[PDB]
């Protein structure tokens, strides 16, 4: 069925503009309508507006009218939202979605499709990639420390996603310096420490930081 | 800035029912039959449970039901299960060509057992010490209810400088996680016999210790 894939996380200065993209695949793009819904930290869901991909017609929430546009490139099945005049209140997770408000004459197509969300942070601060440190170990816990990055978010996988059992990636701490750090730990059989390679894959899109760190026993 | 009014929280016991409300005006909830209800787990896209006041999309069990009278819509969740803990948002067409949302009601399912924290403590890595830095990493998971306090010790002496601890966060299994970091110089790390992270929860404590 049709899926929506959004662009990666961004950081922008106060007053600037940000564009989030939303690429449709799996069905006719023009059959759907693209809504944008955000959630700022500590706030609830907030609808921003909607776009008809065929015509480009839009409706925007009164709250954003004057500093938002919603556009599309039909040739690449992609929708865009550009939000301008950014303030701290615009730091949020932004979703595109085909919403279900009024149903069809029959209900077979009465379903929603949501993108994965794009994190946008409004800050005057510089982006910086993390330093990734291996945390060496019946079962043994091994990990990696993702130190000093801005802004959120960072993703972590293990063995390129082949290792999922026993993985726990923790929410980041916000240090006094203003930078973030997080850790991810995986619990594995101790007997495998001398025979299995373990690698944490860390990605910080804003800083073009992608590191695969081998975690060896000491 | 939520246009519709929802109480911030609700609770119920397993197998029982809970009803949560969403109030609007005659120009939205009371003017149209385009009320939806969304289930939102942290970190995941909202999942619509009800649309057009009463209708369920495919795969939503009949224990979720919606209704409306006047300017008030209601969602009733029967046969409550732990997986139903989430923040529930109502929405309505309204205003002028707008979709309005309520502020969300966070649902707690009562009766969940006490759970002591699991604690993992890592010392500074060789690589970090070479960079002239040192961080102790105390990772705390699987506790319930969602509150802990963390104490750090150098040998047996309390240390508070350089500590930074997260707020508790809900895990997918209904329990909570947190982490605590102790920043030290390499000299401080090498100078002491050991360092400890002590996690207290409901009056009981779990302690881990690491050494150079």
């Amino acid at each position: 069925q049709m899926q929506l894939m959004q662009s990666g996380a961004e950081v922008k200065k106060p007053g600037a503009s940000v564009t989030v993209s939303c690429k449709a695949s799996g069905d006719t793009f023009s059959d759907y309508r693209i809504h944008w819904v955000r959630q700022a930290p500590g706030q609830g869901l907030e609808w921003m507006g909607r776009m008809n991909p065929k015509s480009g017609d839009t409706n925007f929430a009164q709250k954003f009218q004057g500093r938002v546009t919603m556009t599309r490139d039909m040739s690449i099945n992609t929708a865009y939202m550009t939000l301008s005049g950014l303030t701290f209140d615009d730091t949020a997770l932004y979703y595109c979605a085909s919403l279900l408000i009024v149903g069809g004459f029959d209900p077979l197509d009465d379903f929603e499709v949501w993108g994965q969300g794009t994190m946008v942070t409004i800050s005057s601060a510089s982006t910086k990639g993390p330093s990734v440190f291996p945390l060496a170990p019946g079962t043994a816990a091994l990990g990696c420390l993702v130190k000093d990055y801005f802004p959120e978010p960072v993703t972590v996988s293990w063995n390129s996603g082949a290792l999922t059992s026993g993985v726990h990636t923790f929410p980041a701490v916000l240090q006094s310096s203003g930078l973030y750090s997080l850790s991810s730990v995986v619990t594995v059989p101790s007997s495998s420490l001398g025979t299995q390679t373990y690698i944490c894959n860390v990605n910080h899109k804003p800083s073009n930081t992608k590191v695969d760190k081998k975690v060896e026993p000491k | 800035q939520s246009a519709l009014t929802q109480p911030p929280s609700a609770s119920g016991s397993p197998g029982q029912s809970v009803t949560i409300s969403c109030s609007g005006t005659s120009s939205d909830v009371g003017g149209y039959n385009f009320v939806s209800w969304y289930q939102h787990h942290p970190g995941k896209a909202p999942k619509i449970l009800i649309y057009e006041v009463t209708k369920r999309p495919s795969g939503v069990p009949d224990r979720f039901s919606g209704s409306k009278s006047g300017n008030t819509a209601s969602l009733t969740v029967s046969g409550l299960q732990a997986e139903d803990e989430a923040d529930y948002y109502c929405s309505s067409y309204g205003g002028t060509n707008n979709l309005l949302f309520g502020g969300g009601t966070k649902l707690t399912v009562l009766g969940q057992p006490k759970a002591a924290p699991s604690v993992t403590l890592f010392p500074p890595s060789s690589e970090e010490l070479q960079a002239n830095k040192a961080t102790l990493v105390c990772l705390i998971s699987d506790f319930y209810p969602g509150a802990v306090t963390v104490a750090w010790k150098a040998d047996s002496s309390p240390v508070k400088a350089g500590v930074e601890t997260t707020t508790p966060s809900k895990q997918s299994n209904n329990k909570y996680a947190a982490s605590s970091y102790l920043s030290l110089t390499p000299e401080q790390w090498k100078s002491h016999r050991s360092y400890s992270c002590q996690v207290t929860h409901e009056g009981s404590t779990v302690e881990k210790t690491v050494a150079p």
Binding site: D57, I101, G103, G104, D106, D109 | -
Partner: peptide, 14 residues
């Protein structure tokens, strides 16, 4: 009958 997108267009008409 038309697809549901067109019904939503009417709901949001200008």
């Amino acid at each position: 009958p038309s697809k549901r997108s067109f019904i939503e267009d009417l709901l949001f008409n200008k």
